[PDB]
């Protein structure tokens, strides 16, 4: 009646008041966001960006092909029966077909293939992703050595205690390789 609609409404007229001051207190916090072209995020030590190649190390034995998920890396090789060894002449991994699973870099004894860190490889034509053996053998792009990036670190690379990579003036990873070599 006239004695209910000003008391059956305060049950939710004050729930928004304890919902407004909660959401309004999210604006006081620092905006956790990683602006890409100006603050690139440093990848991990095991991140699999794209493949690096050394031309004078792969003696044409195609274990890069036999453990590939889709038999991708194109090994163009002759038998070369004059010098009693097989030597290749081309090595092309079609990116775009290339998932970055890195089975070639695991099953190799001679340590030829290797993963870089770059990922910003986004062209205008798919046939420009057929990286040649001298086009995979170029230098990586390191996100620290660029005079526009302010390269912030990742989680599990901050020091122990902090869960943000923005306002970090110094520090390192939260463990040491050899503290316990001269101690124990």
């Amino acid at each position: 009646q006239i004695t209910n609609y000003a008391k059956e409404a305060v049950q939710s007229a004050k729930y928004i008041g304890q919902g407004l001051s909660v959401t309004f207190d999210h604006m006081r916090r620092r905006p956790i966001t990683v602006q890409y072209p100006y603050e690139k995020l440093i990848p991990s030590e095991r991140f699999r960006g794209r493949i690096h190649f050394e031309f004078d190390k792969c003696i044409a034995c195609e274990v890069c092909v036999r453990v590939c998920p889709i038999n991708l890396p194109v090994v163009d090789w002759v038998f070369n029966k004059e010098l009693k060894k097989k030597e290749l002449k081309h090595y092309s991994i079609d990116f775009g077909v290339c998932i970055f699973c890195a089975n070639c870099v695991e099953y190799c004894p001679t340590n030829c293939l290797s993963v870089t860190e770059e990922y910003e490889l986004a062209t205008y034509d798919r046939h420009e992703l057929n990286y040649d053996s001298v086009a995979m053998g170029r230098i990586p792009y390191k996100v620290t050595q660029d005079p526009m990036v302010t390269p912030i670190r990742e989680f599990a690379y901050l020091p122990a205690g902090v869960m943000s990579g923005h306002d970090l003036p110094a520090g390192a990873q939260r463990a040491g390789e050899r503290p316990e070599a001269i101690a124990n």
């Binding site: 205008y124 034509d125 046939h127």
Partner: protein, 111 residues
Amino acid sequence: MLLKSTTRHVHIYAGHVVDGEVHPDTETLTLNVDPDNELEWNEAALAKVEAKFRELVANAAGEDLTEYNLRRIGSDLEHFIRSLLMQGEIGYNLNSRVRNYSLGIPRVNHS
């Protein structure tokens, strides 16, 4: 229902086009080759596929009206449109705003 087969170079519909709004029929098949203009055509090869379009509709005129059969025709036109390019009859467009060369790259014959 408007059963159809929409690939990039081939848009086979089941029905005749009456000024943009397609009406689904039971007898006819509309085909427009290259709605996006990726291949620059000419006078002859726009009439060469009619020797393959009207062949494939007539030769396969004993099967059902499913979109599996409208696709099975369109997968043979787009394998005839490619055989025009590997014979060098038509060529890619260069006024086109995209340049991905979806039917293979330009390459010379025997090195």
